[PDB]
């Protein structure tokens, strides 16, 4: 079908060969840093529980949920 010119463009290669890894690396950094973590709030292996009581907290809571979550996270 269509799409085989640009991919065979050569200039395309230029523009993207510079852009793609550029992106691939930004995320790989967004992941390594922690934003990935701190924005999506997911727990780093380190933060599950608190080594002194389990309760997969809930939540429970609620409200008041949030406020509740906050404390939860904090105490953790």
């Amino acid at each position: 079908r269509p799409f085989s010119d640009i991919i065979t463009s050569v200039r395309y290669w230029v523009i993207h060969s510079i852009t793609i890894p550029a992106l691939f690396i930004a995320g790989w950094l967004f992941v390594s840093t922690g934003l990935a973590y701190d924005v999506f709030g997911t727990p780093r292996p380190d933060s599950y529980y608190a080594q002194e009581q389990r309760s997969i907290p809930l939540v429970t809571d609620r409200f008041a949920k949030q406020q509740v979550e906050t404390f939860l996270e904090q105490l953790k």
């Binding site: 079908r1 269509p2 292996p45 380190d46 933060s47 599950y48 529980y49 080594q51 389990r54 997969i56």
Partner: protein, 332 residues
Amino acid sequence: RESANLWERFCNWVTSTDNRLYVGWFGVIMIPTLLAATICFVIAFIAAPPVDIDGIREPVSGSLLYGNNIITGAVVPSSNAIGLHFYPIWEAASLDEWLYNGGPYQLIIFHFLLGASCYMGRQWELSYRLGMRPWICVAYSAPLASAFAVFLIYPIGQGSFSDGMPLGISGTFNFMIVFQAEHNILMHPFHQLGVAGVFGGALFCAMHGSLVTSSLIRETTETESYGYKFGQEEETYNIVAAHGYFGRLIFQYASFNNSRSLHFFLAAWPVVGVWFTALGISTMAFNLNGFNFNHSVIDAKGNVINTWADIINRANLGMEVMHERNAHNFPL
């Protein structure tokens, strides 16, 4: 003689009748094989003595006259004791022993297959008997597989027809459940592809039929118613418009030769999807279960953090924990 002369030449020409018746030839096996079983099934299902399906002495009764309705089981599987042995209806002076040891089951089974197997064989003769092209034959090679799995393979895999799907609605419902707690199937590619296959096929069938009719436208018616218207021429639908709408909806479409390729694609997607699922089982029979992702850990300590796949287990467990008592021791 009688068997002798042109008679034969004539006989041969009739079966041949173408457308115318219804058927013909293959039927010469299919036909009779299938009648025995169909008949054995009907009678057992309408009325027959509880079967010692399990390896023990707690007779299950899936037949109608002994306290059933259609949804509640059919002909329960041979005994865990006969296991793999060949238990016709000769062995033992009494037939009453046959019913008990759940013998009717093996009759049906062995015949059905052997028949539906011939059915696949005959399924192609009338091809090579009207100019037709084979293939359709292999299309039926997909369900036959799935049937040898559930009746020969699995048992030959685990040592006894005793296990491996019973005739009738519930009996299947059993088979099915049990088995998933025993292999996490849902977590096995080969089933997955079976679902994509089947789930898809319907999906596709919807479309072909859908777009066709929508053409156609043419217217016738117014318112008222338508258816018716138717026847063858001329055609009744006339492609182009179809393509002119489909393409417009999803994007630009392409294949070897529309209709000629827009039909092969139908003929295979489900077929291969189901195929693997025939294997998938034949696989899990000789025992090689689906995936098992039970433990990811918080390795900051080792306490284990769950995962949607843990629950899957919890349930499979309480499914494993009961089942037969049967078973015783340690475991299985």
